Write an enzyme that holds these catalytic residues in place. Sequence first.
Site, short mmCIF file in Angstrom:
data_model
loop_
_atom_site.label_atom_id
_atom_site.label_comp_id
_atom_site.label_asym_id
_atom_site.label_seq_id
_atom_site.Cartn_x
_atom_site.Cartn_y
_atom_site.Cartn_z
CD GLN A 166 11.30 -11.79 -17.84
OE1 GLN A 166 10.99 -10.66 -17.47
NE2 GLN A 166 12.08 -12.02 -18.88
N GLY A 226 6.47 -6.70 -11.79
CA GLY A 226 5.15 -6.13 -11.65
C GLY A 226 4.19 -7.25 -11.33
CD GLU A 235 17.95 -30.44 12.62
OE1 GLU A 235 18.97 -30.48 11.93
OE2 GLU A 235 17.53 -31.42 13.26
N1 LIG Z 1 18.90 -13.14 -12.28
C1 LIG Z 1 17.96 -12.91 -13.18
N2 LIG Z 1 17.15 -11.80 -13.06
C2 LIG Z 1 16.19 -11.57 -13.96
C3 LIG Z 1 16.01 -12.44 -15.01
N3 LIG Z 1 15.00 -11.96 -15.75
C4 LIG Z 1 14.54 -10.83 -15.19
N4 LIG Z 1 15.28 -10.57 -14.08
C5 LIG Z 1 15.10 -9.44 -13.16
O1 LIG Z 1 13.75 -9.05 -13.10
C6 LIG Z 1 13.68 -7.69 -12.78
C7 LIG Z 1 12.39 -7.09 -13.28
O2 LIG Z 1 11.32 -7.95 -12.97
P1 LIG Z 1 10.61 -8.75 -14.16
O3 LIG Z 1 10.69 -10.24 -13.98
O4 LIG Z 1 11.26 -8.33 -15.45
O5 LIG Z 1 9.08 -8.25 -14.18
P2 LIG Z 1 7.90 -9.32 -14.04
O6 LIG Z 1 8.06 -10.13 -12.79
O7 LIG Z 1 7.86 -10.19 -15.26
O8 LIG Z 1 6.57 -8.43 -13.92
P3 LIG Z 1 5.90 -7.78 -15.22
O9 LIG Z 1 6.84 -6.77 -15.83
O10 LIG Z 1 4.62 -7.10 -14.81
O11 LIG Z 1 5.58 -8.86 -16.23
C8 LIG Z 1 14.88 -7.07 -13.45
O12 LIG Z 1 15.48 -6.13 -12.60
C9 LIG Z 1 15.84 -8.21 -13.66
O13 LIG Z 1 16.99 -8.00 -12.88
C10 LIG Z 1 16.82 -13.55 -15.14
O14 LIG Z 1 16.67 -14.33 -16.08
N5 LIG Z 1 17.80 -13.79 -14.22
MG LIG Z 2 6.65 -10.49 -16.96
#
Ligand SMILES: Nc1nc2c(ncn2[C@@H]2O[C@H](COP(=O)(O)OP(=O)(O)OP(=O)(O)O)[C@@H](O)[C@H]2O)c(=O)[nH]1
Ligand SMILES: [Mg+2]
Lengths: 50, 610, 64, 79, 431
Positions: E11, E136, E246
């Site tokens: 995400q 995750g 590089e």
């Molecule tokens: N910089 C930034 N970080 C993000 C953003 N959205 C989520 N995160 C980070 O993503 C971390 C958690 O991972 P997620 O992306 O929510 O989880 P996932 O990869 O979707 O995995 P699942 O929960 O199984 O669906 C959090 O600690 C956030 O800091 C975003 O839009 N910008």
């Molecule tokens: Mg997700």
Amino acid sequence: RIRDSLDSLTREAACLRAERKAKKEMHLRSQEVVKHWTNTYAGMKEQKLE
Amino acid sequence: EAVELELEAVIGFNGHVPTGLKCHPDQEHLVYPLGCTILIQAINTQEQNFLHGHGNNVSCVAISKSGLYIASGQVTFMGFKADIILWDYKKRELMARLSLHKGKIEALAFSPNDMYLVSLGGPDDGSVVVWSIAKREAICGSPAAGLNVGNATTVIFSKCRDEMFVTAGNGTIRVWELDLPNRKIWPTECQTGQMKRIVMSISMANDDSFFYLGTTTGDILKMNPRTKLLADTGPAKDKFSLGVSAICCLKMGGLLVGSGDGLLVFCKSPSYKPIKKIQLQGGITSITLRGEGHQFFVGTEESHIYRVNFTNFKETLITTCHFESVEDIVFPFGTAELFATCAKKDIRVWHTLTNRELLRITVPNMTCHGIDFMRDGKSIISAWDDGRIRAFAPETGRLMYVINNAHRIGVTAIATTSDCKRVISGGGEGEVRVWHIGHQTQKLEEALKEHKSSVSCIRVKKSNEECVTASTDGTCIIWDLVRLRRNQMILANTLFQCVCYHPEEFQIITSGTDRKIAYWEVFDGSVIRELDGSLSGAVNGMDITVEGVHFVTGGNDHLVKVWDYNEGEVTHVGVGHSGNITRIRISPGNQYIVSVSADGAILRWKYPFP
Amino acid sequence: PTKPTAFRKFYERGDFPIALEHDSKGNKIAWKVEIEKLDYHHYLPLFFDGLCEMTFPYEFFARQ
Amino acid sequence: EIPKDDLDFRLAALYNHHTGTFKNKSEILTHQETIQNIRHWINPKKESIHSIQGSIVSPHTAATNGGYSRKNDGGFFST
Amino acid sequence: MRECISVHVGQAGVQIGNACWELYCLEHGIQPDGQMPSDSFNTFFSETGAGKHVPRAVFVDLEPTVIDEVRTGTYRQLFHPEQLITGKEDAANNYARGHYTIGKELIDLVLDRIRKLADQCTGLQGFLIFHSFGGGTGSGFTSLLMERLSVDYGKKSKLEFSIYPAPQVSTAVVEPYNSILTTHTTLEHSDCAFMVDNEAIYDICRRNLDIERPTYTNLNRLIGQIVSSITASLRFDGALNVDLTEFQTNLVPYPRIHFPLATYAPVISAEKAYHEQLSVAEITNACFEPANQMVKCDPRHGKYMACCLLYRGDVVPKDVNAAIATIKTKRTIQFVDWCPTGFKVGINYQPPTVVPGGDLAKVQRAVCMLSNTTAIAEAWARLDHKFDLMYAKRAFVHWYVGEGMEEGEFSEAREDMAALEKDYEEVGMDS
Ligand SMILES: Nc1nc2c(ncn2[C@@H]2O[C@H](COP(=O)(O)OP(=O)(O)OP(=O)(O)O)[C@@H](O)[C@H]2O)c(=O)[nH]1
Ligand SMILES: [Mg+2]
């Protein structure tokens, strides 16, 4: 371009002279309208002195 | 001093509260509310006697059966009174101010013998009171809301002149009987078997035999006021879509139902079946029937008044306007016959003389702030609260372009350069931005971030070279165009609303909350003089004609003011609406002055010579 | 003028066991299956048909 | 338009041979020249107020701030 | 013609790429539907004969909720309708859902799209993955991906712009479980790893810039500007040009110290740009402060081992040499014996671009830097302490042994991080 390059500084001076003249003349004509207005504080003081 | 000009061309409507439209029993004049007053329209559109008062927004209207008295409630702050006002229909005089409730007044009704009026009041402190007309006082009152039930909305008398019904807000249906010598009203409840509806309109039959309730669930309930029991259920198999919002009766037993999804259905009592159905514009909230019987009127939530014939059910719209706070009219240059009016979700293009509406353009649910034309007739730019600047085609409403992320808050003021190449935007962030347009794309050059607060208006010189940004910070900047830097600042003690140039560009004039119309020297920001507002209101809109001797000013009270330019000469014809006027422009032919009152009302007067 | 070839259609279906790595010394066709026991009744008269293509990604596959 | 008898009988006959049964000659050949507000525009995507992304405006009317948040370590924090 | 492939897994990857892929549309003339109005676009966008330009990026999430914002938002005509691979149910902070039983379904599709894009580039130069440590799916899908991608292609370079969990603040509970497992993957089948965190971008977003209430749409634009600075020399022209080997040969001394920080130098508002002079000598010096790290550590208590830079804009290299000499003279900045140069400079001939609605000014000079430093072992110490304090009482491990993962790999990634933390100090000690 090279024929008219010999007078490059005179147009630079002329534009500043024209803009300063136009600005100050606008100030003077607005002062004319202000002095023709009648509800001013100093004008009311002059009418009260009259 | 203060000579009244003339008054013409009332435009607006309030159809946002139920049953606002009621034709009086001589079947010529239609009364209907507006933002803070009442209006009476004839067949000849003779606006008549806006009846003044109420201190705040009218919300409920009830008419005596003979056709001589009208009474309208209103709404105020928490823990404040709210006044019924008895008027006349011959000499339009405030007879009786009846001010005894808490908060606001939800419902009013008359008795068929003219002696008695009844009032329901209170969202929280709910009570019913009965007023007499021989002496402008209350007979008796009681809590008209079932404890351990909910609240109540509407009331209606009988034709026994003594018993009146309070109607379910959430499922309380209670008959009261009135006796004079004990001076009392007695509560009985109509017990229903398993039904618990949210009743949302009511009417009564002629012979007091049955009264009907329209509910939110969509089914029409018939009642019996003698048995004090449920009389009849509603339709199964195509209950109406939204809630039943508007129920009317006939002399015979054919009830006219209307639902808030914009549907009109003819209905009868054993089988609630749509014999004659017509789908209308917007949610219906009022039905009013002419005493002749064969023609009637429909008031809708989106402010459309529908004259519809009872025979063959053909409709004809007769009045349209906006339905939120309106802002920022602008005439086209060179044409005095067109209007653009923008408001929440909507933009409309009007006529001026015959007041027809020519087109209407909707953004779904966001808010507009400013509208402007091009210097030519090519496009109409507008500034919206979604963080976007749009521009639209003049006819057919095509979206030529949008700008994705203009500011950080909603873009407030927008301005046109006379060479049709540049658009200046200011918004609530304060990042003043300049947009160069082209045939292919549109781009941003430089962000000027002087300001610390909002931006009200942007106005540019006759030949583009300089501009000015009226703002609610206390600073009005003059910028130059050909380079992007600042020349001069007006620093003043007024939250600015309108800053206008003098024709021939000698001086610039400011207004706002602090009610000091102030002329300003074009250099150094040196103040000249201050001429006061009316008394303890505010001012939001200025106007100067082509020449520069007339000076139109409009503001927070009802007063629009014609002024002489050089000296302070006032000319009041501001007797119109006190819904807060926010912008005002003169026609380019110097014929009409047009003002937009916030609660939707666009009014034009004739031109006086200053 | 050129014509639509069947090499393109068989590649967009995805039948060919072919791959590419643009190795720095030169573009190389990576082979996922043994070359010595292919089906030459299938894969020669379609590469010979893909000889007729001028646009970038398929002429290289046909030639190599 | 017609250049001969063949295109006269078939250019406009208006006679299905499959459906017209027990007909006549004049009923076969029959051509067709014998026989004879307020306007508005609606945006397509109904947008939402809640799903907008420009900023998060302050709870206090920070033109004249209501609960003073300074910038961390001295100065103005907002806009 | 010097192309790249940039995947966004999870995400956080997809929501960063949503803010990466308009900065590329605004650097060039590519308007959002794909039609430039009027080949330095070549590395990022392919072109198609109806005028339409298409991206080179893959977007994957095992739940469909976030890709369906893009699929009906403002950038729906831009992306190809199979660059957007969706699913039904997520992984939900479990590494095993993603790298194991339920995550082995979409891997063939993401590898088909990697193959079908990489088979059309004339020159291939490597991979830019955007995957979250915090996920995750963003930390299990990518570990399922890279172990097969590096078998297929092999020698090409891998750069990941990942999101490190902050030391104090964190927004999940099994982050010390999901962080430790993916570094059994990224040590062996990966070649660089740029981490950032979320607390320090809030820091640098409120102190150097007058933003109250900073969010993810403020994080993702700065981390998009960093990647548009690292991908500058493949797309533009200038004095010293550094390519995607590089610097990635410059930056990895030993094959297990490949974890460098990142820093972007000019970050300032629209008002106070007029009052700072903004010279090369001062925005080189802004890079080496302890306040301006996007990753929450102090580099002073460690030592910079190797560095880099990525300039842009209107610079001429005499200023840069006079800056670097002063940086070598200073003593806040400490080095090691085994790199006596410790610098690498690229230049370019392009200013930064200003996306509308962004809160940055049009600065001309722009610097990035990317530092191999041994003081990220402190942040790995702080997340190192978090693991055995939960594995001591065997907490949450049934959610991992349920979806196909044995218990002993907790101990395996334990001794993997133990060997890595042995390696950093053993290569940071003097001789
Ligand atoms: N910089 C930034 N970080 C993000 C953003 N959205 C989520 N995160 C980070 O993503 C971390 C958690 O991972 P997620 O992306 O929510 O989880 P996932 O990869 O979707 O995995 P699942 O929960 O199984 O669906 C959090 O600690 C956030 O800091 C975003 O839009 N910008
Ligand atoms: Mg997700």
